[PDB]
Design a protein around this ligand. Sequence first.
Ligand SMILES: *[C@@H]1O[C@H](CO)[C@@H](O)[C@H](O)[C@H]1NC(C)=O
Ligand SMILES: [Ca+2]
Ligand SMILES: [Zn+2]
Length: 441
Amino acid sequence: EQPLVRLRGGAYIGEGRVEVLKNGEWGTVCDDKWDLVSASVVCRELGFGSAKEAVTGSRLGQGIGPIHLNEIQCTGNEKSIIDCKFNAESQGCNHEEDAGVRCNTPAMGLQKKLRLNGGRNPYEGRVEVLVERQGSLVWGMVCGQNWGIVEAMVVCRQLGLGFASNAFQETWYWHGDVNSNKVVMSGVKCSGTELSLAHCRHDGEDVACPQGGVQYGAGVACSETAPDLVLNAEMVQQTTYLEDRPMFLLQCAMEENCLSASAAQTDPTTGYRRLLRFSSQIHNNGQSDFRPKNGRHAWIWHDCHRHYHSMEVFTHYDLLNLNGTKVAEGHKASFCLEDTECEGDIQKNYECANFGDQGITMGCWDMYRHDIDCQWVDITDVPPGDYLFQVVINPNFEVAESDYSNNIMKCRSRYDGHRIWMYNCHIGGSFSEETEKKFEH
Ligand SMILES: *[C@@H]1O[C@H](CO)[C@@H](O)[C@H](O)[C@H]1NC(C)=O
Ligand SMILES: [Ca+2]
Ligand SMILES: [Zn+2]
């Protein structure tokens, strides 16, 4: 069956921004006359107790797109928040008033088979797991090989410390209490939704770990907040065009690797690249600032843009066959991360200009306009046809977010050979499943 309401953002199951399925599109509810009784109608609909809290003002993060409901006024007797009386004009409403709930839910009371060990912070440590070894109950560690944010998220969730902020593959700097210095779990990969590290895929007590620095064990760092990046779909829709650019203006772009491979043999003096340009306006809609993983030492000067780029692979840009295999070669752009404009009265902070600190503030967005170099897919080699355009933000889960189900954007693309039409542009998971089907057929 298809649910008509869901929670996004927010760390604990049963907590988050209320979003509702209306006209095949998910969309938020404005917080005017948001009340506890209505809130607890969504808590009951999702099968938890009832609202501790009727959260207002997007405190658990913002949405983008349609604000569907407004001034909800449930009686308390409705089987679903889509039955309560509501005011359908949200015009005075924006996405700093997206409502949210904190439902009463059971806490699985205490954790005894998993712990964080070492470190001065309750919120971080090497992750250790209780096992049985030769009769004794001992604490061992987890293989660090391919230990990422997603697994880290499952640990922090299981331990009740909110989100993951970091994951570590090799930890040698953490002391703690006596262990066994022996890897005890390994090969762990989590989907993200698991309720305990052990419920992810892992090999069992046959714990193949490599021999190296990854044998010390994975650690996490957890936080009660996290950023949430979203691409602005309406805008790649409004800003898309073709340009065939003489090669003599793409000298910079060539060396910074912004062209597909055929460009090597394209005539500098006389040649084209056909460039599908567009604007990437990435919002930070989560609960804290988005920040690059590394400090200044790792940032790399972008010759074309003439500023430092703190994230070497911020996006995947691709044009795809309808089956899903790339028809273009696509690109892995790198990004200066700054606040170009903010919502409402929020104050711009991060700036790239003078080796400035980089990041995207809560409530702001970072816009890489269509005319800037590398905002394209090179399409010189691509024949006319019926394709899917896709943009993935933060594609390798390199920096922690409160939601990765929204980091993908797809448009249907009809290419004449002479012009292109981008339509049905949207954030994956913003449509109903049936409707998400009709967009590929
Ligand atoms: C679909 O992808 C497959 C790759 O297995 C490719 O062979 C085929 O040409 C694609 N279909 C079309 C018509 O683009
Ligand atoms: Ca996101
Ligand atoms: Zn840049």
